[PDB]
Coordinates of C-alpha atoms in Angstrom, one line a residue:
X8 CA 7.0 -22.2 -33.5
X9 CA 6.4 -22.4 -29.8
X10 CA 8.4 -22.8 -26.5
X11 CA 7.8 -24.6 -23.1
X12 CA 9.1 -24.5 -19.5
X13 CA 8.8 -26.3 -16.1
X14 CA 9.1 -24.4 -12.7
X15 CA 9.8 -27.4 -10.4
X16 CA 13.2 -28.4 -12.1
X17 CA 14.6 -25.2 -13.2
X18 CA 18.7 -25.4 -12.8
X19 CA 18.7 -22.4 -10.4
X20 CA 22.5 -21.5 -11.4
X21 CA 21.4 -20.6 -15.0
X22 CA 18.5 -18.3 -14.1
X23 CA 18.9 -14.9 -15.4
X24 CA 17.5 -11.4 -14.8
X25 CA 14.8 -9.9 -17.0
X26 CA 15.7 -6.2 -17.1
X27 CA 13.7 -4.8 -19.8
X28 CA 11.5 -1.8 -19.1
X29 CA 8.2 -1.3 -20.4
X30 CA 8.6 0.7 -23.3
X31 CA 5.1 2.2 -24.2
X32 CA 4.4 5.8 -25.6
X33 CA 3.7 8.7 -22.7
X34 CA 1.0 11.3 -24.2
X35 CA -0.2 14.4 -22.2
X36 CA -2.8 16.8 -22.9
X37 CA -4.7 16.6 -26.3
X38 CA -2.4 14.0 -27.7
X39 CA -3.7 11.7 -24.9
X40 CA -7.4 12.7 -25.6
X41 CA -7.3 11.6 -29.2
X42 CA -5.2 8.4 -28.3
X43 CA -7.9 7.4 -26.2
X44 CA -10.4 7.7 -28.8
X45 CA -8.1 5.7 -30.9
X46 CA -8.3 3.0 -28.5
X47 CA -12.1 3.2 -28.2
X48 CA -12.4 2.9 -32.2
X49 CA -14.3 -0.3 -33.3
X50 CA -11.5 -1.1 -35.8
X51 CA -7.9 0.5 -35.4
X52 CA -8.6 0.3 -31.5
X53 CA -7.9 -3.4 -31.1
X54 CA -5.1 -3.1 -33.6
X55 CA -3.2 -0.7 -31.6
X56 CA -3.8 -2.4 -28.3
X57 CA -2.6 -5.8 -30.0
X58 CA 0.5 -4.0 -30.9
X59 CA 1.2 -2.9 -27.3
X60 CA 0.8 -6.5 -26.2
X61 CA 3.2 -8.1 -28.7
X62 CA 5.7 -5.2 -28.4
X63 CA 6.2 -5.9 -24.6
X64 CA 6.2 -9.8 -24.9
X65 CA 2.7 -9.8 -23.3
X66 CA 1.8 -12.0 -26.7
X67 CA 4.6 -14.3 -26.7
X68 CA 3.9 -15.2 -23.1
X69 CA 0.3 -15.8 -23.3
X70 CA -0.1 -17.3 -26.7
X71 CA 3.3 -18.6 -27.8
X72 CA 4.4 -20.4 -24.6
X73 CA 3.4 -23.8 -23.0
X74 CA 3.2 -24.0 -19.1
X75 CA 2.8 -27.1 -17.5
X76 CA 1.8 -26.0 -14.1
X77 CA -1.9 -26.2 -13.1
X78 CA -3.9 -23.0 -12.8
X79 CA -3.5 -21.3 -9.3
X80 CA -6.3 -18.7 -9.2
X81 CA -6.0 -17.6 -5.5
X82 CA -3.0 -17.7 -3.3
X83 CA -2.8 -21.2 -1.6
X84 CA -0.7 -21.1 1.3
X85 CA 1.2 -24.1 2.9
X86 CA 1.1 -24.9 6.8
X87 CA 3.7 -22.4 7.9
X88 CA 6.2 -23.0 11.0
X89 CA 5.3 -20.8 13.9
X90 CA 6.8 -17.5 14.5
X91 CA 9.5 -17.1 17.0
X92 CA 9.1 -14.9 20.1
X93 CA 5.6 -13.5 19.4
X94 CA 2.2 -12.9 21.4
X95 CA -0.8 -14.9 20.0
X96 CA -3.8 -12.8 19.7
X97 CA -7.4 -14.0 19.1
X98 CA -8.7 -13.7 15.5
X99 CA -12.3 -13.0 16.7
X100 CA -11.2 -10.6 19.8
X101 CA -12.8 -7.2 19.6
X102 CA -10.2 -4.8 18.5
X103 CA -10.6 -3.1 21.7
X104 CA -9.0 -6.3 23.4
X105 CA -6.7 -6.5 20.6
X106 CA -5.2 -2.9 21.0
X107 CA -4.6 -4.0 24.9
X108 CA -2.4 -6.9 24.0
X109 CA -0.6 -4.6 21.3
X110 CA 0.0 -2.1 24.2
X111 CA 1.8 -4.6 26.2
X112 CA 4.1 -5.4 23.1
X113 CA 5.1 -1.5 22.9
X114 CA 8.1 -0.3 24.8
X115 CA 7.0 1.9 28.0
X116 CA 6.0 5.2 26.9
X117 CA 8.6 8.1 27.9
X118 CA 6.6 11.2 28.7
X119 CA 10.0 13.2 27.5
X120 CA 8.6 12.9 23.9
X121 CA 5.2 14.6 24.4
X122 CA 5.6 17.3 27.1
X123 CA 9.1 18.6 28.2
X124 CA 10.5 17.8 25.0
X125 CA 13.9 19.0 24.4
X126 CA 14.1 22.3 22.6
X127 CA 17.2 21.7 20.9
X128 CA 16.2 18.3 19.3
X129 CA 15.8 16.6 15.5
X130 CA 12.6 16.2 13.9
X131 CA 9.8 13.6 14.7
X132 CA 6.4 12.6 14.0
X133 CA 3.5 12.6 16.7
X134 CA 2.7 9.0 17.6
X135 CA -0.6 7.5 18.4
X136 CA 0.6 7.1 22.1
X137 CA 1.6 10.8 22.1
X138 CA -2.3 11.8 21.6
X139 CA -3.5 9.1 23.7
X140 CA -1.3 10.7 26.2
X141 CA -2.4 14.3 26.0
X142 CA -5.8 13.2 25.8
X143 CA -5.8 11.3 29.3
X144 CA -3.4 14.0 30.6
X145 CA -6.3 16.7 30.0
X146 CA -3.6 18.7 28.1
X147 CA -5.9 18.6 25.0
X148 CA -9.1 17.2 23.8
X149 CA -10.1 15.5 20.7
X150 CA -12.5 18.2 20.0
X151 CA -9.6 20.8 20.2
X152 CA -7.7 18.6 17.6
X153 CA -10.6 18.4 15.3
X154 CA -11.2 22.3 15.2
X155 CA -7.4 22.7 14.4
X156 CA -7.6 20.1 11.5
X157 CA -10.7 21.4 10.0
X158 CA -9.0 25.0 10.1
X159 CA -6.2 23.6 8.1
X160 CA -8.3 21.8 5.3
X161 CA -10.5 25.0 5.0
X162 CA -7.7 27.4 4.9
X163 CA -5.6 25.7 2.5
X164 CA -8.3 24.1 0.5
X165 CA -7.6 20.6 1.1
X166 CA -11.1 19.4 0.4
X167 CA -11.3 21.6 -2.9
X168 CA -9.6 21.4 -6.2
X169 CA -6.7 21.4 -7.5
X170 CA -4.7 20.0 -4.6
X171 CA -6.9 18.2 -2.3
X172 CA -6.0 15.9 0.4
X173 CA -9.6 14.5 0.7
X174 CA -12.6 14.3 -1.9
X175 CA -15.2 13.9 0.8
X176 CA -15.1 16.1 3.8
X177 CA -17.9 16.6 6.6
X178 CA -16.6 19.0 8.9
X179 CA -20.0 18.9 10.7
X180 CA -19.6 15.2 11.3
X181 CA -16.0 15.3 12.7
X182 CA -17.2 17.7 15.3
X183 CA -20.1 15.3 16.3
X184 CA -17.4 12.4 16.5
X185 CA -14.9 14.3 18.4
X186 CA -17.6 15.6 21.0
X187 CA -18.5 12.0 21.9
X188 CA -14.7 11.3 22.3
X189 CA -14.2 14.3 24.4
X190 CA -17.3 13.4 26.6
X191 CA -15.9 9.8 27.0
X192 CA -12.4 11.2 28.3
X193 CA -14.3 13.6 30.4
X194 CA -16.3 10.7 32.1
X195 CA -13.0 8.9 32.5
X196 CA -13.6 5.9 30.4
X197 CA -12.1 5.8 27.2
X198 CA -12.5 3.1 24.9
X199 CA -8.9 2.3 23.8
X200 CA -5.6 3.9 22.8
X201 CA -7.2 4.5 19.4
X202 CA -10.1 6.6 21.0
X203 CA -9.7 10.2 19.6
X204 CA -7.3 9.1 17.0
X205 CA -7.8 10.7 13.6
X206 CA -7.9 8.2 10.8
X207 CA -8.3 8.9 7.0
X208 CA -10.2 6.2 5.0
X209 CA -9.3 5.8 1.2
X210 CA -12.2 6.7 -1.2
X211 CA -12.4 2.8 -2.3
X212 CA -13.5 1.8 1.3
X213 CA -17.0 2.2 2.7
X214 CA -16.8 4.8 5.5
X215 CA -20.3 6.1 6.7
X216 CA -21.8 8.3 6.1
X217 CA -19.8 9.4 3.0
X218 CA -20.6 7.7 -0.4
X219 CA -17.8 5.5 -2.0
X220 CA -16.8 6.9 -5.3
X221 CA -13.5 5.5 -5.7
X222 CA -12.2 8.4 -7.2
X223 CA -14.7 9.0 -9.8
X224 CA -17.6 11.2 -10.2
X225 CA -20.5 8.8 -10.8
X226 CA -19.9 5.9 -8.7
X227 CA -22.3 7.1 -5.9
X228 CA -25.0 7.0 -8.4
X229 CA -24.8 3.4 -8.9
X230 CA -23.3 2.1 -5.8
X231 CA -25.1 2.7 -2.7
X232 CA -23.3 2.8 0.8
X233 CA -25.6 1.5 3.4
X234 CA -23.3 0.4 6.2
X235 CA -19.8 0.5 7.5
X236 CA -16.9 -1.6 6.3
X237 CA -14.9 -4.5 7.9
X238 CA -12.0 -2.2 8.7
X239 CA -14.0 1.0 9.6
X240 CA -16.4 -0.4 12.0
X241 CA -13.2 -2.2 13.8
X242 CA -11.6 1.5 14.1
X243 CA -14.9 3.0 15.1
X244 CA -15.4 0.2 17.8
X245 CA -12.1 1.6 19.3
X246 CA -13.2 4.9 19.4
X247 CA -11.3 6.3 16.4
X248 CA -12.3 9.6 14.7
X249 CA -12.9 8.8 11.0
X250 CA -11.8 12.0 9.2
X251 CA -13.0 11.5 5.5
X252 CA -12.5 9.9 2.2
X253 CA -8.9 10.3 0.7
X254 CA -7.9 11.3 -2.7
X255 CA -6.7 8.2 -4.9
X256 CA -5.8 7.5 -8.5
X257 CA -9.1 6.6 -10.1
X258 CA -10.1 3.1 -9.3
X259 CA -6.6 2.1 -8.5
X260 CA -5.3 2.0 -12.0
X261 CA -2.4 4.0 -11.6
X262 CA 1.0 4.3 -9.5
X263 CA 1.5 8.2 -9.9
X264 CA -1.5 9.6 -8.3
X265 CA -2.8 11.5 -11.1
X266 CA -6.6 12.2 -10.6
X267 CA -7.7 14.5 -13.4
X268 CA -11.3 14.4 -11.6
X269 CA -10.7 16.0 -8.2
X270 CA -7.1 17.3 -8.6
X271 CA -3.8 15.5 -8.3
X272 CA -2.5 15.4 -4.5
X273 CA 1.1 16.8 -4.3
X274 CA 3.7 15.4 -2.3
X275 CA 4.1 17.0 1.1
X276 CA 8.0 16.7 0.6
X277 CA 7.7 18.7 -2.7
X278 CA 4.5 20.0 -4.2
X279 CA 5.7 20.0 -7.6
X280 CA 6.2 16.0 -7.6
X281 CA 3.9 13.1 -7.4
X282 CA 2.7 11.5 -4.4
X283 CA 2.4 8.0 -5.7
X284 CA -0.6 5.6 -6.3
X285 CA -3.0 4.2 -5.9
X286 CA -3.2 5.4 -2.1
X287 CA -2.1 8.9 -3.1
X288 CA -4.1 11.2 -1.0
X289 CA -4.2 8.9 2.0
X290 CA -0.3 8.5 2.1
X291 CA 0.3 12.4 1.6
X292 CA -2.2 13.4 4.7
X293 CA -0.1 11.4 6.9
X294 CA 3.1 12.6 5.7
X295 CA 1.8 16.2 6.1
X296 CA 1.2 15.3 9.9
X297 CA -2.7 16.2 9.5
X298 CA -3.6 12.7 11.0
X299 CA -2.2 10.0 12.8
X300 CA -2.7 6.9 10.3
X301 CA -4.7 6.1 7.2
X302 CA -6.2 3.0 5.7
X303 CA -6.0 2.0 1.9
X304 CA -5.9 -0.7 -0.4
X305 CA -3.1 -2.4 -2.0
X306 CA -3.4 -4.7 -5.1
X307 CA -0.2 -3.7 -6.9
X308 CA 1.8 -1.8 -4.3
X309 CA -0.8 1.0 -3.6
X310 CA 0.2 1.3 -0.1
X311 CA 3.9 0.6 -0.2
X312 CA 4.7 2.9 -3.2
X313 CA 3.4 6.3 -2.0
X314 CA 4.7 5.4 1.6
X315 CA 8.3 5.3 0.1
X316 CA 7.6 8.6 -1.9
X317 CA 6.3 10.6 0.7
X318 CA 8.4 8.9 3.7
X319 CA 5.9 7.1 5.8
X320 CA 5.4 3.4 7.1
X321 CA 3.1 1.6 4.8
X322 CA 1.9 -2.2 5.8
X323 CA 0.7 -4.5 3.1
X324 CA -0.8 -7.4 5.0
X325 CA -1.2 -11.2 4.0
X326 CA -3.9 -11.9 1.6
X327 CA -7.0 -12.6 3.6
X328 CA -5.5 -11.5 6.8
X329 CA -7.4 -8.1 7.2
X330 CA -11.0 -8.4 6.1
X331 CA -12.2 -6.4 3.1
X332 CA -16.0 -6.8 3.2
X333 CA -17.1 -3.3 2.5
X334 CA -14.7 -2.0 -0.2
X335 CA -14.3 -1.9 -4.0
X336 CA -12.0 -4.8 -4.3
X337 CA -13.9 -7.6 -2.6
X338 CA -13.1 -11.0 -3.9
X339 CA -9.9 -9.9 -5.7
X340 CA -6.8 -12.2 -5.7
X341 CA -4.1 -9.5 -5.0
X342 CA -5.8 -7.0 -2.9
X343 CA -5.7 -6.4 0.8
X344 CA -6.4 -3.4 3.1
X345 CA -3.4 -2.2 4.9
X346 CA -2.5 0.9 7.3
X347 CA -0.2 3.8 6.5
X348 CA 1.2 5.8 9.3
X349 CA 4.2 8.1 10.1
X350 CA 5.8 5.7 12.6
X351 CA 6.1 1.7 13.1
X352 CA 4.4 2.2 16.6
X353 CA 1.4 4.0 14.9
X354 CA 1.0 1.5 11.9
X355 CA 1.3 -1.7 14.0
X356 CA -1.4 -0.3 16.6
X357 CA -3.8 0.3 13.5
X358 CA -3.2 -3.2 12.1
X359 CA -3.9 -4.6 15.7
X360 CA -7.4 -3.3 15.3
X361 CA -8.2 -3.7 11.7
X362 CA -7.2 -7.2 11.4
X363 CA -9.4 -10.1 11.4
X364 CA -10.1 -12.4 8.3
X365 CA -13.5 -12.6 7.0
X366 CA -15.7 -16.0 7.5
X367 CA -15.3 -16.7 3.9
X368 CA -11.4 -16.1 4.0
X369 CA -11.3 -18.1 7.3
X370 CA -12.3 -21.6 5.7
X371 CA -10.7 -20.8 2.1
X372 CA -7.3 -19.6 3.3
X373 CA -6.9 -21.2 6.8
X374 CA -4.9 -18.3 8.3
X375 CA -2.8 -18.9 11.3
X376 CA -3.9 -17.0 14.6
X377 CA -2.8 -13.4 14.5
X378 CA 0.1 -12.4 16.6
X379 CA 1.9 -9.2 17.3
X380 CA 5.6 -8.9 17.7
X381 CA 7.2 -8.1 21.2
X382 CA 8.3 -4.7 20.1
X383 CA 9.8 -4.3 23.8
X384 CA 13.4 -5.5 22.8
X385 CA 14.5 -6.6 26.1
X386 CA 15.0 -9.4 26.3
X387 CA 15.1 -9.1 22.3
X388 CA 17.4 -8.5 19.5
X389 CA 18.2 -12.2 19.4
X390 CA 15.4 -13.0 17.2
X391 CA 16.2 -9.9 15.0
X392 CA 19.8 -11.1 14.6
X393 CA 18.9 -14.7 13.7
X394 CA 17.0 -13.3 10.6
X395 CA 18.1 -14.4 7.2
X396 CA 17.9 -11.5 4.7
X397 CA 17.2 -12.4 1.1
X398 CA 18.8 -10.2 -1.4
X399 CA 18.8 -10.5 -5.3
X400 CA 21.6 -8.4 -6.2
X401 CA 20.8 -7.8 -9.9
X402 CA 17.2 -7.2 -8.7
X403 CA 18.5 -5.0 -6.0
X404 CA 20.5 -2.5 -8.0
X405 CA 18.0 -2.2 -10.8
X406 CA 17.2 1.4 -9.7
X407 CA 16.9 4.6 -11.5
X408 CA 18.8 6.3 -8.8
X409 CA 22.2 5.3 -7.3
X410 CA 21.3 6.8 -4.0
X411 CA 18.6 4.4 -3.4
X412 CA 20.8 1.0 -4.2
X413 CA 23.3 2.7 -1.9
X414 CA 21.1 4.0 1.2
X415 CA 19.2 0.4 1.1
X416 CA 22.4 -1.4 1.0
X417 CA 23.6 0.7 4.0
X418 CA 20.4 -0.4 6.0
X419 CA 21.6 -4.0 5.0
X420 CA 25.2 -3.4 6.4
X421 CA 23.6 -1.6 9.3
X422 CA 21.3 -4.5 10.1
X423 CA 24.2 -7.1 9.8
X424 CA 26.5 -5.0 12.0
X425 CA 23.9 -4.3 14.9
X426 CA 22.1 -7.7 15.2
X427 CA 24.0 -10.0 13.1
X428 CA 21.4 -10.6 9.9
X429 CA 23.1 -12.6 7.3
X430 CA 22.5 -11.2 3.8
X431 CA 21.9 -14.3 1.9
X432 CA 22.0 -14.0 -2.0
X433 CA 18.9 -15.1 -3.6
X434 CA 17.3 -15.1 -7.4
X435 CA 13.8 -14.5 -8.2
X436 CA 13.2 -16.4 -11.6
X437 CA 10.6 -15.1 -14.3
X438 CA 10.0 -11.7 -13.3
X439 CA 8.9 -10.5 -16.5
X440 CA 6.3 -13.2 -16.2
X441 CA 5.1 -11.8 -12.7
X442 CA 4.8 -8.5 -14.6
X443 CA 2.2 -9.9 -17.0
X444 CA 0.7 -12.5 -14.6
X445 CA -0.2 -9.5 -12.3
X446 CA -1.4 -6.9 -14.9
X447 CA -4.1 -9.3 -15.9
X448 CA -5.1 -10.8 -12.6
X449 CA -5.8 -7.4 -11.2
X450 CA -7.7 -5.7 -14.0
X451 CA -9.7 -8.7 -15.1
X452 CA -12.0 -8.5 -11.8
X453 CA -12.0 -4.7 -11.9
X454 CA -13.2 -4.5 -15.4
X455 CA -15.6 -7.2 -14.7
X456 CA -17.1 -5.5 -11.8
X457 CA -17.4 -2.1 -13.8
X458 CA -18.7 -3.8 -16.8
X459 CA -22.3 -3.3 -16.1
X460 CA -21.8 0.3 -15.4
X461 CA -19.6 1.1 -18.5
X462 CA -21.9 -0.9 -20.9
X463 CA -24.6 1.4 -19.2
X464 CA -22.8 4.6 -20.7
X465 CA -21.2 5.6 -17.8
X466 CA -17.8 4.7 -19.5
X467 CA -17.5 8.1 -20.7
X468 CA -17.7 9.6 -17.2
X469 CA -14.2 8.2 -16.6
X470 CA -10.9 9.5 -16.9
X471 CA -8.6 9.0 -19.9
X472 CA -6.0 7.2 -17.7
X473 CA -8.5 4.6 -16.7
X474 CA -10.1 4.1 -20.2
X475 CA -6.5 3.7 -21.5
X476 CA -6.2 0.8 -19.2
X477 CA -9.6 -0.5 -19.6
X478 CA -9.0 -0.7 -23.5
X479 CA -5.9 -3.0 -23.0
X480 CA -7.8 -4.8 -20.2
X481 CA -10.7 -5.7 -22.7
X482 CA -8.0 -7.4 -24.9
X483 CA -7.5 -10.1 -22.3
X484 CA -9.1 -13.2 -23.0
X485 CA -10.5 -16.1 -20.5
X486 CA -7.6 -18.1 -22.2
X487 CA -5.1 -15.5 -21.2
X488 CA -6.4 -15.4 -17.5
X489 CA -6.2 -19.3 -17.2
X490 CA -2.5 -19.2 -18.7
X491 CA -1.8 -16.3 -16.5
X492 CA -3.1 -18.2 -13.2
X493 CA -0.7 -21.0 -14.1
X494 CA 2.2 -18.4 -14.0
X495 CA 1.1 -17.6 -10.4
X496 CA 1.5 -21.2 -9.6
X497 CA 5.1 -21.0 -10.8
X498 CA 6.3 -17.9 -9.0
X499 CA 4.3 -19.3 -5.8
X500 CA 6.7 -22.3 -5.8
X501 CA 9.8 -20.1 -6.5
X502 CA 9.3 -17.7 -3.4
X503 CA 8.1 -20.6 -1.4
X504 CA 11.5 -22.1 -1.9
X505 CA 13.4 -18.8 -1.5
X506 CA 11.6 -18.6 2.1
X507 CA 13.1 -22.0 3.0
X508 CA 16.6 -20.3 2.8
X509 CA 15.9 -16.8 4.2
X510 CA 13.1 -15.2 6.3
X511 CA 12.2 -12.0 4.3
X512 CA 13.1 -10.7 0.9
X513 CA 14.8 -7.0 1.4
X514 CA 14.3 -4.9 -1.6
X515 CA 13.9 -1.2 -2.5
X516 CA 10.2 -0.1 -2.6
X517 CA 10.6 1.8 -5.7
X518 CA 13.2 2.1 -8.4
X519 CA 13.1 5.8 -8.4
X520 CA 12.4 8.6 -6.1
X521 CA 9.5 11.2 -6.0
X522 CA 9.0 12.0 -9.9
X523 CA 8.2 15.6 -11.1
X524 CA 4.7 15.9 -12.2
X525 CA 4.5 17.0 -16.0
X526 CA 2.4 20.0 -16.0
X527 CA 0.9 19.2 -19.3
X528 CA -0.6 15.9 -17.6
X529 CA -2.6 18.0 -15.1
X530 CA -5.5 19.0 -17.4
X531 CA -6.9 15.3 -18.4
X532 CA -4.0 12.9 -17.3
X533 CA -1.2 10.8 -18.7
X534 CA -0.2 7.4 -20.0
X535 CA 3.3 7.2 -18.9
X536 CA 3.8 3.3 -18.7
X537 CA 7.6 3.5 -18.4
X538 CA 6.7 5.4 -15.3
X539 CA 3.8 3.6 -13.8
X540 CA 5.6 0.3 -14.3
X541 CA 9.1 1.1 -13.1
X542 CA 7.3 1.9 -9.6
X543 CA 5.7 -1.8 -9.6
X544 CA 9.2 -3.2 -10.2
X545 CA 9.5 -4.6 -6.5
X546 CA 5.8 -4.4 -5.1
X547 CA 4.0 -7.1 -7.5
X548 CA 5.6 -10.1 -5.5
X549 CA 3.4 -9.5 -2.5
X550 CA 0.2 -9.0 -4.4
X551 CA 0.3 -11.9 -7.1
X552 CA 1.4 -14.4 -4.4
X553 CA -0.4 -12.8 -1.2
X554 CA 2.8 -12.2 0.8
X555 CA 2.9 -9.3 3.6
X556 CA 5.4 -6.7 2.7
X557 CA 6.1 -3.3 4.5
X558 CA 7.9 -0.2 3.4
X559 CA 9.8 1.6 6.2
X560 CA 11.4 4.8 5.5
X561 CA 15.4 4.4 5.3
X562 CA 16.7 7.8 4.3
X563 CA 16.7 10.5 1.7
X564 CA 18.5 10.9 -1.8
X565 CA 20.5 13.7 -3.2
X566 CA 17.6 16.1 -3.5
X567 CA 16.1 15.3 -0.1
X568 CA 13.5 13.0 -1.4
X569 CA 12.4 10.0 0.9
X570 CA 13.7 6.5 0.2
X571 CA 11.8 3.4 1.6
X572 CA 12.8 0.0 1.7
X573 CA 10.5 -3.2 1.4
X574 CA 10.5 -6.2 3.7
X575 CA 8.4 -8.9 2.3
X576 CA 7.9 -12.0 4.7
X577 CA 6.3 -15.4 4.8
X578 CA 2.5 -16.0 4.8
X579 CA 0.9 -14.8 7.9
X580 CA 4.1 -13.4 9.1
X581 CA 3.0 -9.8 10.1
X582 CA 4.8 -10.1 13.4
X583 CA 8.3 -10.9 11.5
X584 CA 8.2 -7.8 9.1
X585 CA 6.9 -5.7 11.7
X586 CA 9.7 -6.5 14.1
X587 CA 12.4 -6.2 11.5
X588 CA 11.1 -2.9 10.3
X589 CA 11.3 -1.6 13.8
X590 CA 14.8 -2.4 13.9
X591 CA 15.3 -0.5 10.4
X592 CA 13.2 2.5 11.9
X593 CA 15.5 2.6 15.0
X594 CA 18.6 2.4 12.6
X595 CA 17.3 5.4 10.4
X596 CA 14.7 7.5 11.9
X597 CA 12.7 10.2 10.0
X598 CA 14.7 13.5 10.7
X599 CA 13.6 15.7 7.7
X600 CA 10.4 17.7 8.1
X601 CA 8.6 17.9 4.8
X602 CA 7.8 21.1 3.0
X603 CA 4.0 20.8 3.7
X604 CA 3.8 19.9 7.2
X605 CA 1.4 21.0 10.1
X606 CA 2.6 20.5 13.7
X607 CA -0.4 19.8 15.9
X608 CA -0.8 19.9 19.6
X609 CA 0.8 23.4 20.0

């Protein structure tokens, strides 16, 4: 008839692992086209969608189950204990001043990395301090770096279909910015360490003067971009060079990166494989080495998932930690804006500038003052060793590739052997509920904000991948949402209890390596839910509950595809996950040069 539960009293010795994958049909090409028209039919449309809900147990959860927890709409964080051995930074400090305190947290820069590099050494990425050194050593100039990047984009067609890194590129604007930075360096007064650094902005973040289309071909007609966003104006105040708008899965509704609107961005490690959504074009341009770092939203693993498939460092900050004023996901309950970079030193620097909670999030969330980790490890490595690592073994090994579970376990054994971290066995109850509770809490505000435009006939101007999800999102009633917010309160109490025993929850970022692109899906898209969900298996926790997570590269699988490990920490614990990710990077640095890679500063 019906069933019921209660979170604050579950016997955690009997909790069991829900290992049922999302079994939904995958269609490509013309079969996908007629299937979307099936869902958008006035009669047989809702019948097929109601079958998909009932099949994957989403009806039994939202309709045939009693929940005692009260509705928790937004993440509500308790008063957290202060982080150990950090540097408190002002929340209203100018990002110029914040970058300076961040430079003190870094180890002293060795010029042996930039110039006089040993000819017989391994592969390495160029860091932000590498460019900041050659700019001040008059070895090069931001104008010369801009002309070299503009040439690469124009030569290989990275602003044109079918394989573009960007979907809005103004070469005449980049030269205008690089000239001002070059002039400031010649005058001898650079703004900050980020002065002259090339940063790519995702297409769902307002960056002047480009319009914000979010991956669509019509959003600029309805949405006007009149001023910079919060994260962009902070980078521009530091002197950073804003490259252009990055390719992305349309409106964030996809974890593969299929954009049958501007072309699917290809993985720099293998162009025949997917790069990972939703921040698809932003994580690829960093992995290819064209720019230092890139910003992007993350409401369902959009920053961490492609950072693991491409082999870069993606930072998912705490809910409300980084302001979102001026993006397509303002007011959302699972989304933030985190940086994607090639190294931990780079991503940490970008976070130092873009952080700063909004005035609305300041009073509602009450964030602790932002603090940077002392990444100079002397005296240190006593705080790294005292960390308790939470591992759900059954959850840890539920990956479709045995190399991912083995390499991620190697870093756990390496972290326990070099610093002394204790791998504490944990358990995450009600994981299938976290799936259903997330999918509705991310699509409901998106479908709501896009409804006045879809009702305005512009729904036909959307891709088939999005309209397939939008057809299912319309099947979510207001009663379903209220029941789902109660599930968020349950999982919030579970994870808050886990953080009483451990400090971070270490998990593989994705259940699979970089998957091959089905060639039939490059025409109008696909609807593989078994694949688009298997990537979200480990990243939903940080979104539904607002936790900060970070995916740091740890190695490569059999076919040489990168592997990323996720480190999710306590609320407002950016310095804790960044510091541990630095020890992981030191224990497993990037060594394989990707296929599509462009070495700058020759």
